[PDB]
Design a protein around this ligand. Structure first.
Ligand SMILES: Nc1ncnc2c1ncn2[C@@H]1O[C@H](COP(=O)(O)OP(=O)(O)O)[C@@H](O)[C@H]1O
Length: 780
């Protein structure tokens, strides 16, 4: 609830002039390295490392470091970065967004501050959108860093949990956004601390930062795959519809508890499966399901504070009436859904880890970013991520002709018009690139060109390697490309022999996008480095962004403002109005990603807690914190079990409270002062501590350097398994289709926080039984 996003914050043009000066300072010492030997140069890396630790700052050696990388580059790649690029680096070094246009040299610029900030040995992460663009940048700029005496590392989805660590080991590491997200999450599902692949998140430099932080924001990162030896076993758990005498366990208190089972059930239930009463021989599975299925019949019921069907189960609110869409029953009460009544089964995928890129990337101590289009959502870059967008003067003045939208009346005429324009361009031999929004519209224009027999290339948004090769050749004479929205990103389109003289790459958008950012991106592909190029969008009156005008009629003027689909139309007015629709569409998207951020935030805080607690259960032998924790978890279960079977009218009739003790914690001799034995809550501390601590001491004596072993595979499991994976899944469920009546979107923020901390309070409690019961009742 701090400030409010999109309103206003600090400046430009004190920041730029400062940079300018720096660049010119860089050029000043340009001679100090130019005739230096190769060895003397490499030595600078060391010299910098020595200076930094002795007391100097990154900022203190900027001019120079940058000057060294510049000279290096010129010697390794052939390219001596321009002042505009030098400026870029500063923009990034300040943890800002460097906005430079397509064809400007971002990757080069990234080496500059990447180097500077990699000298600490803390590491640096150079982020791109996809595998290929990493591997490439890694392989090409790899050279320049290595030359200065630094380790480059490439992180891919293929690599072993070993090779990955070894890459995060490198001074500099390259990766796709996703892996960075994944590797983090996977690190927090680990059984031994080594397995983790990541180091502390120091610095991140996203290239194409808009796609990553603005567009790909609206998806969470999900991990899924379920292995509860599920569907099959749930039917089998439900085989116990009959003779629920010997195992029809005791009743309970508060929200829920059926755990206990008389010896006669267990044994014979177990012979119906084939082992003993399970101790922690991958047994947990059967005990938890049998409890669940046993509960689904007696404990949790039908038609009052439990379930109502449709074809499946929907939690209700017995007093309000309405169906709580999106509410999963904790730790696998699918049992109700599936077999108790109607085979409405439910088990496929399972969410095991979730994160937003806005939370993930905010974990880093420093974020910097690069892209051609990022002045638009600037109020967000500085309000969500604390980065100012710097707009960087191009190296060479743009001589492109971004033409005013042409407006046809219907799809067909607009499409036909697109064909014609490509038709004319091929015949001239001028290369054409056609931006599309949808694979299906991508296909239609191709057919249009297949009837006209105009050789071309479609570009589907997938298999990036091929399309990169395609894209270089889209700047050659007679080239014809049609690029699915987000196709060929990251690659320059270099114009061919004498293509300059035909006007350069001509670009044709088949429609304006959900965001002017995307709109300008398209135009971007054309005017790089001061080559000519023309860009033009086509719009039909016949769709979205154009509804403003559905119901428009006239008194004395040309009705519809572009009639009969003969020719096109132009007016600033209509184009102006398209902007509204665009900007309004941009609004929705902001809101939907704000809400996501707001949803993950609940998870974020929830998850940092559990992550921290898990790892602590892993570093558990010298303080005997696995027993100290196991002791707390036990004392909870009691204090909770004790204080309901004793309300404020009366602490009375101890009989089920007796059962509880015996078939939850301790053997038959779970009776003492049978009932009405005085009457206290804190009498329960002594008497249950007695029968449990004495037993724990004796349980840990017969087989005791192992019980530590025993707790660990008990605690960590039940924590990991029922709690986290079931919460994570159940959460993503509520996030999803919390679309029951009487909620408004992102107000559910209110319901979500509420129902999701409720859930957590419980899941923590479920953990607390699981561990107490098992330590006490699982024997060889
Ligand atoms: N200073 C330079 N000298 C020579 N060539 C350059 C220079 N800067 C960039 N280039 C070339 O122009 C292309 C554009 O640079 P790039 O790093 O891709 O930036 P952008 O992503 O803005 O296009 C690259 O393929 C590179 O080979």
């Amino acid at each position: 609830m701090l400030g409010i996003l999109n309103k206003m914050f600090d400046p430009t043009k004190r920041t730029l002039n400062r940079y300018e000066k720096i660049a010119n300072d860089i050029d000043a010492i340009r001679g100090d390295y130019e005739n230096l030997s190769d060895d003397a140069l490499k030595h600078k890396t060391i010299e910098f490392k020595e200076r930094l630790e002795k007391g100097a700052t990154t900022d203190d050696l900027l001019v120079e470091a940058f000057a060294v990388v510049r000279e290096a580059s010129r010697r390794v790649t052939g390219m001596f970065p321009f002042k505009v690029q030098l400026m870029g680096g500063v923009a990034l070094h300040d943890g800002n967004i460097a906005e430079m246009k397509t064809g400007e040299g971002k990757t080069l610029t990234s080496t500059l501050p990447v180097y500077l900030n990699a000298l600490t040995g803390k590491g640096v992460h150079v982020v791109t959108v996809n595998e290929y663009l990493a591997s490439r940048d890694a392989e090409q700029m790899g050279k320049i860093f290595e030359f200065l005496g630094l380790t480059v590392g490439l992180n891919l989805n293929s690599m072993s949990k070993d090779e990955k660590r070894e890459a995060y080991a490198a001074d500099i590491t390259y990766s796709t956004n996703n892996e960075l997200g994944f590797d983090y999450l996977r690190d927090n599902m680990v059984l031994y601390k080594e397995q983790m692949v990541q180091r502390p998140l120091h610095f991140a430099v996203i290239d194409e930062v808009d796609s990553i932080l603005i567009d790909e924001a609206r998806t969470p990162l999900i991990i899924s795959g379920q292995a509860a030896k599920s569907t099959k076993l749930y039917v089998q758990a439900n085989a116990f519809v009959r003779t629920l005498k010997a195992e029809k366990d005791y009743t309970y208190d508060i929200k829920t508890k059926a755990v206990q089972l008389t010896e006669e059930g267990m044994t014979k239930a177990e012979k119906a499966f084939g082992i003993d009463n399970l101790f922690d021989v991958k047994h947990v599975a059967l005990n938890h399901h049998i409890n669940q299925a046993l509960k689904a019949h007696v404990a949790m019921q039908k038609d009052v504070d439990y379930v109502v069907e449709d074809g499946q189960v929907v939690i209700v609110d017995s007093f309000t009436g309405r169906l709580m869409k999106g509410r999963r029953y904790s730790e696998g009460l699918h049992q109700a859904i599936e077999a108790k009544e109607g085979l409405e089964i439910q088990n496929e995928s399972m969410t095991l880890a979730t994160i937003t890129f806005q939370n993930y990337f905010r974990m880093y101590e420093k974020l910097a970013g690069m892209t051609g289009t990022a002045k638009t959502e600037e109020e967000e870059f500085r309000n969500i991520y604390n980065m100012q967008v710097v707009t960087i003067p191009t190296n060479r003045p743009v001589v492109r002709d971004d033409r005013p939208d042409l407006i046809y009346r219907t799809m067909e005429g607009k499409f036909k018009a697109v064909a014609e324009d490509v038709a004319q361009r091929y015949m001239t031999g001028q290369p054409v690139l056609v931006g599309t929004v949808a694979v299906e519209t991508s296909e239609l224009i191709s057919k249009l060109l297949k009837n006209k027999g105009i050789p071309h290339q479609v570009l589907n948004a997938k298999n990036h390697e091929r399309e990169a090769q395609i894209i270089e050749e889209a700047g050659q004479k007679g080239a014809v490309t049609i690029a699915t929205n987000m196709a060929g990103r990251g690659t320059d389109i270099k114009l061919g022999e004498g293509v300059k003289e035909l006007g350069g790459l001509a670009v044709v958008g088949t429609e304006r996008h959900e965001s002017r950012r995307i709109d300008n991106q398209l135009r971007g592909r054309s005017g790089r480095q001061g080559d000519p190029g023309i860009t033009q969008f086509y719009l039909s009156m016949e769709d979205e962004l154009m509804r403003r005008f559905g119901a428009e009629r006239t008194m004395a003027m040309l009705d519809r403002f572009g009639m009969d689909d003969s020719t096109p139309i132009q007016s600033k007015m209509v184009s102006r109005a398209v902007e509204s629709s665009q900007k309004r569409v941009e609004g929705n998207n902001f809101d939907s990603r704000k809400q996501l951020l707001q949803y993950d935030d609940v998870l974020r805080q929830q998850r940092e807690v559990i992550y921290k607690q898990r790892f602590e259960v892993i570093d558990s032998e010298n303080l005997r914190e696995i027993v100290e924790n196991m002791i707390k978890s036990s004392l909870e279960r009691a204090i909770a079990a004790y204080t309901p079977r004793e309300e404020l009218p009366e602490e009375w009739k101890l009989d089920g409270l007796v059962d509880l003790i015996n078939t939850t914690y301790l053997d038959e001799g779970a009776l003492e002062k049978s009932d009405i034995f005085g009457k206290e809550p804190d009498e329960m501390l002594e008497l249950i501590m007695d029968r449990i601590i004495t037993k724990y001491n004796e349980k840990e004596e017969q087989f005791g350097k192992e019980q530590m072993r025993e707790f660990e595979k008990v605690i960590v499991l039940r924590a990991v398994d029922s709690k986290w994976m079931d919460h994570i899944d159940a959460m993503d469920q509520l996030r999803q289709g919390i679309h029951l009546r009487a909620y408004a979107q992102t107000n559910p923020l209110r319901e979500y926080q509420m129902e999701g901390f409720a859930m957590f309070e419980h899941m923590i409690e479920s953990i607390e039984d699981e561990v107490a019961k098992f330590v006490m009742k699982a024997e060889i």
